[PDB]
Amino acid sequence: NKLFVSKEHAPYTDELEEDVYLDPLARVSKDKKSGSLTFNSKNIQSKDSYINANTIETAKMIENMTKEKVSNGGVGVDVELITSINVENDTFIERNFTPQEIEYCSAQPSVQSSFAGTWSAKEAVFKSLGVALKDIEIVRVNKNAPAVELHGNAKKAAEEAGVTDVKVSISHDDLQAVAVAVSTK
């Protein structure tokens, strides 16, 4: 006879009420002691609520694109809205991605976001060289910086411009994939 359980307390204390009302990003969390869902002062007007992992990654990527951080080399920036990637489109996936890239992206939690991350990397590299994207392979290891490897006509095109190294950074989330490629001679 307890389907209905009246709340004794709001999820906030009287002291936090106004703070909760005034922060649109305030969320409850499990209180370790009570086990109940409450607002904790640490999650009210907290930077972590607003500045997420994708924001931190993307800001770092374009911080490593400022003239003082790195200059004297081809810089390519690509963004892909992940909704643009049809992972069922076997034609587009087989044409533009290597079996290693397809295996890596398929194994990730969001396949679509990972493919968008890889497509954005390939297109950012192509823009950095300045000359199908299967020629440009992105080798991705978990919590490690991705590596660029030029195989077919992309390798020849890089040799023409005297490109020694190509490095790429990738951020991707539920909305967009951003890739910054720096090609150095």
Query: What residues line the site for other proteins (CB under 8 A)?
Result: 3-4, 6-12, 17-18, 20-29, 36-37, 39, 45-47, 49-52, 54-56, 58-59, 62-63, 65-68, 77-81, 83-84, 175-176, 178
Which CB atom, from 68 or from 160, has the smaller least distance to other proteins?
Answer: 68
Residue pair 171/127 in contact (Cβ under 8 Å)? The answer is no
- Least distance between other proteins and beta carbon 57 (Å): 9
| Cβ count within 10 A of residue 75 | 16
Chain centre distance of CA 2? 45
Cα gap 43→36, rounded to integer Å: 15
User: By C-beta, is 41 or 100 nearer to other proteins?
Assistant: 41
Residue whose CB is less far from other proteins, 58 or 98: 58
Q: What's the closest the beta carbon of residue 88 comes to other proteins, in angstroms?
A: 15
Report CA torsion sign: 93, 99, 102, 106. positive
Contact 31, 38 (CB under 8 A): yes
Q: How far is the CB of 156 from other proteins (least distance, A)?
A: 27
